[PDB]
Design a binder for this molecule. Structure first.
Ligand SMILES: [Mg+2]
Ligand SMILES: [Mg+2]
Ligand SMILES: [Zn+2]
Ligand SMILES: [Zn+2]
Ligand SMILES: [Zn+2]
Ligand SMILES: [Zn+2]
Ligand SMILES: [Zn+2]
Lengths: 49, 275, 117, 392, 455, 98, 67, 49, 51, 46, 73
């Protein structure tokens, strides 16, 4: 939630997608790596699980 | 003929815009044909020739010509004495078959200027102005009330043109519609089964369907025939609602009586002996 | 620009008659009327006034094509009354109901309504 | 509308709508496309009804009074460009007023529309009979000694005139010099295309179709306010094509236009979209699955089946009929083989290849077969020697 | 004029028409000629060529004129019949619950061409005159052709219902002396069928009278349809709660049954099927279960449809679409496949990274649990987009290959032809057959017949 | 002029000889709506034989998930060969491994 | 490019109600109420205004309103 | 000077990247136009991946 | 063997429920452009004289 | 007779009416844009 | 036939012979004859390379060479 609060604040406060990546909450994944990950469709499924 | 019924009228409600009424004891074909006249056959005045002197605006010329034709025009006092263009002896135009409008605007101001219906002036006497802002004391008057923003202009643009409005009727172009809309409804409880409802409980009841107030929904009667048609004619504003109805019926009378004269013309010229 | 001028939908041409009558070759006391430049508005109503009459054996109309302004009205009457007179009466009666409707509407407006003008 | 500043752009060919609207039912992905900023179609009131059959099989009955009130009207611009080439040793092209006394050309089209500099000015109406630019090509300088002068001797014509957009108005004319340093012009022509029988339209679900006829407001079928449909699409377009999404969109749209807030349509959620929409539409006051009691325009009687009506964003496409028509009686002949032209753009004639030949064979209409493949494209008479078959 | 289009795949692609000049710029042509030219008015343009003498005009009028092109010599059946809305509108009109009052009957009589001139007596005299739909259809039938059956409609109880009292059941269509006695007309009665009303008409009345029959059926049935109406909305796409429960329960049972077969397979004791590896035995078995699952709920949804489902009315006339579509919109879409097998393992042993390695379950390998109406879940959508390609690609290939196979074939046989002593010979005058087709009959004049003596 | 030339015609390299497969690589940017352009810039092309090939580089491999558009490919002769990049997908510019 | 005079589906004039609408939204976040006060009952007249995009405003901003 | 390299529109080396939305509108350029295509001899040309 | 022909025309097709099975509506402009050679006989001469 | 030729941005006539090269006095631009005709046309509001 | 620098009008010497490109015909205004074997500068006509790959032009049976700089190709 704090990251989302920064994105809403981004409307005037300095912030970027790059900051969001530097937090290490999001990553880039290519098709070769994508073969070995265990990727889940929605937070819903990953929690309800 | 003895089998012609006297129908009957009742006006439920009247406003500056709407006219809402019931016709009873008549035929559907009459109701439907009369609804069609309200659209197509009732004549009115709208811009028909646009001559563009100068146009520096960000809208192309034919676009200005389009918006401009479509704007509404009062006609009630004058739509009758005016004659049709093609019928008129004059070459091109004249005071007797058309009325002239002039528009001249330029943006000399730093703030964006709007071009509106009031800025359009009738060279013809103010018997036939644009719809909005004249004799006013109108509670419909809100903010700008320009009736139509013909275009917007930034500092430097200018617009000069001439227009000739003419009498014509809706069959020929939609700019000549004398109606905002035309409601038409008959047999609200679906007694006559002209439609067949699958699971009739799933349908709502109109303001005319209140009769049994109950939820019994549609009692059948096969010995019936369509009667008592409900109307709500709504004015575009360019011609007041009752005048639309009275002019429609007269025009229909004129069209019918004329067909009778040609049918008479068949018995007078080329004597009706063919059949 | 292969589109027709819009006035032609309703304006009569100088080389065409408003109405034409032709006899049927099959059955007696039938007749065929051709009405030029006139659509369902006139046609549908004249069909109904003819159906209202008790001596008409058959009445109908057809607009042959959407793109061609013209309708035909075929009528068949009993072996005593002529189809032309039935057509004459059908309009005249229709003129009478509409005049009475216009009269009744106008008087109905004459009710103490205060937005008549 | 394809970019904002189009007006100062001499794009060689363009189409813009008068009134674009953003769609009532939109995907969230569309915010990031800016498809709100520059949309491509109009929210039509559609009825999926059978009616008079002018909408059978991939056509539509479209409302004529709506096209009068400017429905889907568009403007068309073609920019023609012409160059004044110096072209080497002893020739020259010149922008000027061509006269039949002074140049080798004399093509039948009228030169009078031109200005005295050879190039028209904005606002004058043009057509396929008009010349837009008077270019001439001085060529022989005088390389035909002794009085082969007479007239029109100095220069050939090759000025450019309208084939295609065989009517319209000149939008803009621009004179400049390009990268060679030659005098260069672009002149732009504006035309306005009213949606007519033969224009191809498509809704958003991959159902394209041609406008089969148009009826005026009087004739459409109607209901309540008499909100007559701007289109009637055939019911048969749905079942074998199962474009159910198309059917939900009217329904989502009906709630969105009425409630007054642009509707969601993003593909994957738990918004129970069929039920939840049906319940909302009914609370407002309609049959919960959208059907309305319609009446026919011809006789006013009710139509016994209730008809599914409501809005759908539709597209008018770049395929419009007046550009696509074509025909030829006798025309230009290419002296490679001297049979009719293939460049339709230059009054071509359609092909009659081996398979069409094969059917005439299969009918057994030999006389018509020799006619299409001979007398009506390419007849010739040659004399041959009876001793030996050489045409020498 | 001779009208054509490309690709011209057979002799009926180019036929003679008479022109009639109209406003606006498209060739406007009869709706019924849509299936011989394989045309759609979704932007397909067609081509016209004009004859330039009386001699070619004579030759066209007699050989290649359209009305003569009705029954194709390829398979002695109609090349063209009553299609789309009219075909749906005919079914709906012929149901014997349809009644017409004096006013509408006269208008339909009015749209008919070759009408006798005499107005038929209404099948119901009192309390008020009414004509049944069959009755007005019966004016449209030319002269007096005859055919039983020629329906094979869904109706009744195939194989044993007609043998159960002949309680007329009204389904089966019977026409006698040019009057429709009973039954409902559909694509099997009116379509390109071997025994359709249209085929018999060509034979009995002659091609000109048959053309008037096509025009008549369409202007008149069509005109009715206008007052009656037709449509399809979300109301023709939903079923009740109970059916919806039954569908989910049928699927929940079948999925548990697949997990059950997977449990048996991992135990190593399944016992394979003949001529197959054990995976094939397994794959053949799960495929049988999922197909049976689709068909069970498919048969449940067709039952659950009400009488008034317009969607069922289009399917039954045979106008457009079919039973499987109802299955997919109302019920459950089912196993997708590509190259005749379930969705391949693209990644290491998996279809998508959203699943576990080696997961033979239905959903994980390409079964769509949903209907088009509820919407597809994200994986199902992509496995559905995969099922979408195989058909688009197949289309682009088949067009190239068949164009080539046809040209080569015509190019061989072109010079063969029946000579005036009726032996069939090619160009160098060699004999192909002593009699054409071994009997010397025409292909457009033959019919299917039963041989009594094989009793 | 060399860069000017190759980029304009759409050819590629030596012109005298090299132009057999890598032909059609530059194109005039289609501008019919706003979408055609965004879609055009975000297009990608697989090279292929031409005029009759039938195989597996035309169907929708599973690994395109999240990468290339499910459904969005020319309805014509080159079905499945010229593809369009999904909405979020991205491309590496690459750098020294050192 | 500016709201059309008269709604396509029926005819009720609608350009006049545009300037009024931007004022109401500035005052209240009630799109329902805004459309209601303007009198746009039936939804064809409503889609007209609700779905319009006023491109003209960005378009006017170029200086060269001179060519 | 060795030659002329075609710039691609609105990239870091094409002057449009630095200007703001009002400035870009002042240069008669669309603010929403995406760039990333070369301009050659009057024609806008895009390279296909 | 695959020649370009004269007297040829091409437009879009749209449906028309009123035509007979073998009629075709032809745009008026295409009908004006393409011609047929009638030969004058002492019967149609008055009709052709009008044309 | 003059051939006007308004120029870009300067918003003034280019005064060129002869064979001399096109270039607007004072203003540094060299694109022209031939001015509207005084000749009347007409437009129907249909 | 060497006296045809565009003259062959049977009844009267020529004054003008207009080219009606669209009909493929040569017309003589003050009467009405048609004299034509029509060509519209063979240079537009061979130009039937179009929808097929035109970037490479397989139809180019005629290179430009640019002779007006030189003389001898
Ligand atoms: Mg097709
Ligand atoms: Mg089809
Ligand atoms: Zn006058
Ligand atoms: Zn010899
Ligand atoms: Zn409205
Ligand atoms: Zn300047
Ligand atoms: Zn002469």
């Amino acid at each position: 939630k704090r990251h989302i609060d920064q994105l809403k604040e981004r409307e005037y406060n300095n912030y970027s997608w790059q900051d969001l990546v530097a937090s290490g909450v999001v990553e880039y994944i290519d098709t070769l790596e994508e073969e070995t990950v265990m990727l889940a469709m929605t937070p819903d499924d990953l929690q309800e699980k | 003929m003895p089998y012609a019924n006297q129908p009957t009228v009742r006006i439920t409600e009247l406003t500056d815009e709407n006219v809402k009424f019931i016709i009873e004891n008549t035929d559907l074909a009459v109701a439907n044909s009369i609804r069609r006249v309200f659209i197509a056959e009732v004549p009115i005045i709208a811009i028909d020739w646009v001559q563009i002197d100068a146009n520096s605006s960000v809208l192309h010329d034919e676009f200005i010509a389009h918006r401009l034709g479509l704007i509404p025009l009062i006609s009630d006092d004058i739509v009758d004495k005016l004659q049709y263009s093609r019928d008129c002896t004059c070459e091109e135009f004249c005071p007797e078959c058309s009325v002239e409008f002039t528009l001249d605007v330029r943006c000399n101001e730093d703030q964006t200027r709007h071009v509106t219906s009031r800025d359009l002036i009738s060279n013809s006497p103010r018997v036939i102005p644009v719809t909005s802002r004249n004799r006013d004391n109108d509670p419909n008057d809100y903010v700008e009330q320009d009736d139509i923003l013909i275009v917007k202009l930034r500092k430097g643009q200018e617009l000069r043109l001439r227009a000739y409005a003419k009498k014509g009727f809706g069959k020929e172009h939609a700019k000549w519609n004398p109606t905002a809309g035309v409601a038409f409804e008959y047999d609200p409880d679906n007694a006559l089964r002209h439609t067949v409802y699958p699971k009739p409980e799933e349908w709502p009841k109109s303001e005319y369907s209140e009769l049994d107030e109950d939820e019994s929904q549609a009692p059948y009667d096969p010995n019936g025939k369509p009667e008592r048609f409900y109307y709500n004619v709504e004015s575009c504003g360019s011609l007041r609602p009752e005048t639309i109805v009275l002019s429609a019926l007269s025009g229909l009378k004129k069209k019918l009586s004329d067909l009778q004269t040609q049918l008479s013309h068949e018995i007078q010229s080329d004597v009706l002996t063919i059949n | 620009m292969n589109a027709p001028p819009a006035f032609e939908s309703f304006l009569l041409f100088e080389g065409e008659k408003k109405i034409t009558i032709n006899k049927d070759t099959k059955v007696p006391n039938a007749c065929l009327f051709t009405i030029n430049k006139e659509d369902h508005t006139l046609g549908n109503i004249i069909k109904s006034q003819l159906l209202k009459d008790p001596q008409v054996l058959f009445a109908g109309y057809k607009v042959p094509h959407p793109l061609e302004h013209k309708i035909i009205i075929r009528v068949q009457t009993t072996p005593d009354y002529s189809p032309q007179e039935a057509f004459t009466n059908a309009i005249t009666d229709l003129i009478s109901e509409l005049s009475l409707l216009e009269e009744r509407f106008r008087v109905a407006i004459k009710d103490k309504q205060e937005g008549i003008e | 509308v394809y970019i904002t500043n189009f007006h100062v752009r001499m794009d060689t060919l363009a189409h813009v709508l008068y009134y674009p609207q953003k769609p009532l039912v939109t995907t969230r992905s569309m915010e990031y496309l800016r498809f709100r900023e520059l949309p491509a179609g109009i929210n039509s009131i559609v009825a999926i009804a059978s009616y008079t059959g002018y909408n059978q099989e991939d056509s539509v009955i479209m409302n004529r009074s709506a096209v009068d009130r400017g429905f889907f009207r568009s403007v068309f611009y073609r920019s023609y460009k012409e160059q004044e080439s110096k072209k080497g040793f002893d020739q020259e092209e010149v922008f000027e007023k061509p006269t039949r006394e002074t140049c080798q050309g004399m093509r039948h089209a009228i030169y009078d529309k031109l200005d005295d500099d050879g190039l028209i000015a904005p606002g004058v109406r043009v057509s396929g009979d008009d010349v837009i630019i008077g270019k001439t090509v001085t060529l022989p300088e005088n390389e035909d000694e002794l009085e082969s002068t007479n007239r029109r001797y100095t220069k050939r014509d090759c000025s450019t005139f309208l084939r295609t957009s065989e009517t319209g108005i000149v939008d803009q004319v621009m004179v400049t010099l390009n990268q060679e340093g030659y005098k260069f012009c672009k002149i732009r022509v504006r035309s306005v295309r009213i949606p007519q029988i033969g224009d191809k339209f498509a809704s958003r679900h991959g159902q394209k179709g041609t406008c089969g006829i148009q009826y005026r407001q009087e004739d459409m079928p109607f209901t309540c306010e008499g909100i007559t449909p701007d289109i009637i699409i055939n019911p048969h377009a749905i079942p074998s094509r199962m474009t159910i999404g198309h059917l939900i969109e009217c329904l989502q749209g009906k709630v969105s236009a009425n409630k007054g807030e642009i509707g969601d349509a993003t593909p994957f959620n738990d918004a129970v979209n069929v039920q939840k929409i049906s319940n909302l539409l009914s609370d407002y006051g309609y049959h919960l699955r959208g059907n309305e009691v319609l009446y026919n325009g011809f006789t006013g009687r009710k139509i016994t089946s209730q008809i599914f009506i409501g809005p759908t964003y539709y597209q008018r496409l770049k395929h419009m009929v007046d550009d696509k028509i074509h025909s030829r009686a006798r025309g230009p002949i290419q002296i490679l083989n001297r049979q009719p032209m293939e460049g339709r753009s230059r009054d071509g004639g359609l092909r009659f290849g081996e398979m069409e030949r094969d059917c005439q064979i299969a009918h057994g209409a030999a006389q018509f077969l020799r006619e299409r493949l001979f007398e009506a494209s390419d007849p010739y008479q040659v004399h041959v020697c009876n001793l030996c078959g050489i045409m020498a | 004029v001779i009208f054509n289009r490309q690709p011209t795949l057979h002799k009926m692609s180019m036929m003679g028409h008479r022109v009639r000049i109209l406003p606006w710029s498209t060739f406007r042509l009869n709706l019924s000629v849509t299936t011989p030219y394989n045309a759609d008015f979704d932007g397909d343009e067609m081509n016209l060529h004009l004859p330039q003498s009386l001699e070619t005009r004579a030759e066209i009028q007699e050989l290649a004129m359209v009305p003569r092109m009705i029954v194709t010599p390829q398979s002695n059946r109609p090349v063209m019949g009553i299609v789309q809305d009219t075909l749906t509108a005919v079914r709906k009109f012929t149901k014997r619950d349809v009644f017409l009052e004096r006013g509408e009957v006269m208008n339909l009589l009015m749209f008919l061409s070759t009408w006798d001139g005499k107005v038929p007596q209404p099948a119901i005299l009192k309390p008020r005159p009414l004509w049944t739909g069959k009755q007005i259809f019966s004016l449209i039938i030319p002269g007096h052709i005859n055919c039983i059956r020629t329906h094979s409609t869904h109706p009744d109880d195939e194989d044993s219902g007609p043998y159960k009292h002949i309680s007329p059941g009204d389904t089966k269509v019977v026409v006698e002396n040019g009057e429709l006695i009973m039954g409902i007309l559909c694509k099997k009665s009116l379509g390109t069928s071997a025994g359709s009303l249209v085929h018999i008409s060509y034979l009995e009345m002659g091609h000109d009278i048959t053309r008037l029959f096509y025009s008549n059926i369409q202007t008149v049935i069509n005109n009715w349809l206008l007052i009656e109406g037709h449509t399809i909305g979300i109301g023709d796409s939903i079923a009740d709660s109970k059916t919806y429960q039954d569908i989910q329960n049928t699927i929940k049972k079948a999925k548990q049954d697949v997990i059950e077969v997977i449990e048996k397979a991992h135990n190593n004791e399944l016992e394979p099927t003949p001529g197959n590896t054990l995976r094939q035995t397994f794959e053949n078995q799960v495929n049988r279960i999922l197909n049976d699952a689709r068909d069970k709920t498919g048969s449940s949804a067709q039952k659950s449809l009400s009488e008034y489902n317009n969607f069922k009315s289009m399917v039954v006339s045979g106008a457009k679409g079919s039973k499987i579509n109802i299955s997919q919109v109302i019920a459950v879409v089912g196993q997708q496949n590509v190259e005749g097998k379930r969705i391949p393992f693209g990644f290491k042993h998996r279809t998508l990274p959203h699943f576990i390695k080696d997961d033979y379950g239905p959903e994980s390998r390409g079964f769509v649990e949903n209907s088009y109406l509820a919407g597809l879940t994200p994986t199902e959508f992509f496995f559905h987009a995969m099922g979408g390609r195989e058909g688009l690609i197949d289309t682009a290939v088949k067009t190239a290959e068949t164009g080539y196979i046809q040209r080569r074939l015509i190019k061989s046989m072109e010079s063969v032809m029946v000579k005036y002593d009726a032996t069939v010979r090619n160009s160098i005058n060699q004999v192909v057959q002593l009699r054409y087709g071994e009997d010397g009959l025409a292909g457009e004049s033959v019919e299917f017949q039963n041989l009594a003596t094989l009793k | 002029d060399g860069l000017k030339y190759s980029l304009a015609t759409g050819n590629w390299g030596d012109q005298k000889k090299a132009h057999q497969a890598r032909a059609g690589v530059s194109q005039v940017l289609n501008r019919l709506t706003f979408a055609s352009t965004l879609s055009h810039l975000r297009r990608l092309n697989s090279p292929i034989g031409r005029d009759g090939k039938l195989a597996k580089p035309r169907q929708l491999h599973n690994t395109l998930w999240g990468m290339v558009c499910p459904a969005e490919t020319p309805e014509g002769h080159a079905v499945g060969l010229v593809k369009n990049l999904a909405l979020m997908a991205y491309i590496s510019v690459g750098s020294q491994p050192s | 490019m500016i709201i059309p005079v008269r709604c396509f589906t029926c005819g009720k004039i609608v350009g006049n109600k545009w300037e009024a609408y931007l004022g109401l939204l500035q005052a209240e976040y009630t799109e329902g109420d805004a459309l209601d006060a303007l009198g746009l009952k039936r939804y064809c007249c409503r889609r007209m205004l609700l779905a319009h995009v006023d491109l003209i405003e960005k378009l006017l901003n170029y200086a060269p309103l001179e060519k | 000077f060795i030659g002329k390299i075609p710039i691609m529109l609105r990239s870091t080396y094409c002057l449009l990247n630095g200007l703001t939305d009002r400035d870009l509108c002042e240069l008669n350029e669309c603010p929403l136009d995406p760039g990333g295509y070369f301009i050659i001899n009057g024609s806008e040309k895009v390279l296909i991946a | 063997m695959g020649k370009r022909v004269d007297f040829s025309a091409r437009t879009v097709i749209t449906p028309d429920p009123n035509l007979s099975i073998d009629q075709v509506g032809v745009p008026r402009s295409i009908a004006a452009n393409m011609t047929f050679a009638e030969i004058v006989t002492p019967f149609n001469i008055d009709r052709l004289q009008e044309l | 007779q003059p051939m006007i030729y308004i120029c870009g941005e300067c918003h003034t006539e280019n005064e060129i009416k002869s064979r001399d090269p096109i270039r607007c006095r004072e203003c540094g631009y060299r694109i022209m844009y031939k001015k509207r005709t005084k000749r009347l046309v007409v437009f129907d509001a249909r | 036939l060497d006296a045809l620098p565009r003259v062959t009008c049977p009844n009267h010497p020529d004054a003008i012979l207009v080219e009606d490109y669209r009909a493929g015909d040569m017309i003589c205004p003050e009467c009405g004859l048609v004299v034509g074997d029509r060509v519209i500068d063979v240079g537009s006509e061979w130009r039937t390379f179009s929808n097929d790959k035109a970037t490479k032009d397989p139809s180019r049976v005629g290179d430009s060479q640019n002779p007006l700089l030189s003389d001898g190709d």
